[PDB]
């Protein structure tokens, strides 16, 4: 149960973490994180609700991210519906507020992407196998290099 100023500082710095292939990041619902931001006084300009129980978010509740019928929900958008936080930030977030009962973290893995300009992004969705796995790797170039909707 760390102090407010250290949560803001540890998380802020951790969000700047580079996207290196094979690393494991976790999603966080915008509903919960936008409130965590208010409580820790995360944004210098909107910093008055800091330390108030009117905005204490409680344990991480990615209920709007999981599907009603028992790592789900298609068409979810990054920045609008969720925030990808790295393994250390997710551990810290879990360490301070706890993970809501009957919930598993929405864990995803960073991969090399792009057929023209190679770049890294956390693969939120998959094809039906990963975009970077090969056709030769799939039966036993990459799936993206080949092409399959």
């Amino acid at each position: 149960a760390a102090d407010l100023d250290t949560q803001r500082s540890d998380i802020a710095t951790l969000l700047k973490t580079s996207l290196r292939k094979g690393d494991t990041w976790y999603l966080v619902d915008s509903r919960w994180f936008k409130q965590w931001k208010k409580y820790v006084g995360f944004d210098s300009w909107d910093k008055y609700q800091m330390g108030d129980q009117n905005v204490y978010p409680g344990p991480i509740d990615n209920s709007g991210l999981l599907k009603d019928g028992d790592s789900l929900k298609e068409h979810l958008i990054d920045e609008l519906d969720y925030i990808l936080l790295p393994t250390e930030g997710w551990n810290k977030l879990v360490s301070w507020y706890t993970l809501m009962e009957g919930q598993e973290p929405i864990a995803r893995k960073v991969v090399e992407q792009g057929m023209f300009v190679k770049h890294c992004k956390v693969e939120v969705y998959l094809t039906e196998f990963s975009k970077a796995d090969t056709i030769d790797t799939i039966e036993k170039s990459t799936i993206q290099d080949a092409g399959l909707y």
């Binding site: 580079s18 944004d43 992407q113 792009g114 057929m115 023209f116 300009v117 190679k118 770049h119």
Partner: protein, 296 residues
Amino acid sequence: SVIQNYNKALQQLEKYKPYEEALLQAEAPRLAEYQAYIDFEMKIGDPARIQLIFERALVENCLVPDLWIRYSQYLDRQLKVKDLVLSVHNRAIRNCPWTVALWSRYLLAMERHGVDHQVISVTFEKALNAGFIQATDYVEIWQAYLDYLRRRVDFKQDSSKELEELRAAFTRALEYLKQEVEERFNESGDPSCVIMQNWARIEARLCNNMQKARELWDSIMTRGNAKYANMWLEYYNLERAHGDTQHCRKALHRAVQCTSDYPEHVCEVLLTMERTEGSLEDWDIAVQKTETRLAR
């Protein structure tokens, strides 16, 4: 003296007699005759008289956007009085709303004279609704508002309300072109992805975020821009400054493959960098890769 002034006055009205007869003898709207009088008065340099002759021209030629631009540009660059300036930019867009330039110009004039953000951002919305005949115009006024929103940002501050605002605007602009402009013109208006290019350059040079700029440039190339050498080299140059060699290397290798218009140029750019900083086997790999492309 009363008379000494009377004469001095009259004396300083002889120089305009030709210009006044020219107008008088001419029939409405007297465009060429007003144009000369404007040319002449602007050389003299009396602000009161220049304002008057432009005003005289508008009583017969307000329908012409160019006259508004000529009049506005003069007030913008020479008179520099917020009051008298913004009035004409307001009138210009009221008379010729279909003309994008007038809105764009109005926005800079407002920014130049430090008009509140709340006010400037509202004028921009009015522009979006005026109604232009073509897709490029919609891009042109988006470029305007994004350059304005960019000048509000203090990039010294790592994270800020203005930067957050800037990014959201780009995302809105890019969606606006994909939803509204695509549906109305069956075209984006930004074929070379100037708006996206503009963002990647900011994101790289001013936000230490090459990863976004890469993600962006892959989308650019994906929107039919890999065939061009200049597009590859723009990306390359961006990486060379705000990235690293490994990425420059992988990029130029992919560029020799994708380039259609001018592969020889791309090849030579590669061979130069490997000559300037690469290992020998990198220089060799390059030679083979370039040759292989030039074989076809």
